[PDB]
From Swiss-Prot:
Stretches assigned to the Peptidase C3 domain: 2-180
Quaternary organization: Interacts with host IFIH1/MDA5; this interaction inhibits host IFIH1.
Functional description taken from the UniProt entry: Major viral protease that mediates proteolytic processing of the polyprotein. Cleaves host EIF5B, contributing to host translation shutoff. Also cleaves host PABPC1, contributing to host translation shutoff. Binds and inhibits host IFIH1/MDA5, thereby inhibiting the type-I IFN production and the establishment of the antiviral state. Cleaves host MAP3K7/TAK1, resulting in inhibition of TRAF6-triggered NF-kappa-B induction. Cleaves host TICAM1; this interaction allows the virus to disrupt host TLR3 signaling. Cleaves host IRF7, resulting in inhibition of type-I IFN production.
Protein name as catalogued: Protease 3C
Length: 181
């Protein structure tokens, strides 16, 4: 509908796949080469389904900060025959707050879904499902089951992936450029 939705669509149309684990179907962001991200609660194993095709997992790393605190991001290298468009230049370098973000989801349950979530707070610490988590972004939208892995964007930046909510707020894990050197 406007330039925020334009940037979000451009990311969804080229840099997402549908990932299925034993814990559900997730929006999965491809970042560069065969490297993608997914919420750590997806419990990625040795095999994952990518657009309903059986795919070997070459590597999976559940990120933690240097205090050994959960970040809720798993970086996955896929045994896929095709590379993603490199979007690392759209990743922020530092923790920040944002205006006018969009959350975009693409699954069997929610195809072509886009949500203007408004202002995004650097929330920091969250007890996420009982697990102490750092580098959390918050937005005041009543996000639902089926939105985990959703991509959070502003114009020109890919800033996080949706990892949870409390019924009134939604929470995303930050993406930082330094995760993908």
């Amino acid at each position: 509908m406007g330039p925020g939705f334009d940037f979000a669509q451009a990311i969804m149309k080229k840099n997402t796949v549908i990932a299925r684990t034993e814990k559900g179907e997730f929006t999965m962001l491809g970042v560069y080469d065969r490297v993608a991200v997914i919420p750590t609660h997806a419990s990625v194993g040795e095999i994952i389904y990518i657009n309903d095709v059986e795919t070997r997992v070459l590597d999976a790393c559940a990120l933690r900060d240097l205090t050994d605190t959960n970040l809720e991001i798993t970086i996955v290298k896929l045994d896929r025959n095709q590379k993603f468009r490199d979007i690392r230049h759209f990743l922020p370098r530092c923790e920040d707050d944002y205006n006018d973000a969009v959350l975009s989801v693409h699954t069997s349950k929610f195809p072509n879904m886009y949500i203007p979530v408004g202002q995004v707070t650097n929330y920091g610490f969250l007890n996420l499902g009982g697990t102490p988590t750092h580098r959390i972004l918050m937005y005041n939208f009543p996000t639902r089951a089926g939105q985990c892995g959703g991509v959070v964007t502003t114009t020109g930046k890919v800033i996080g992936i949706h990892v949870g909510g409390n019924g009134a707020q939604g929470f995303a894990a930050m993406l930082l450029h330094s995760y993908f050197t």
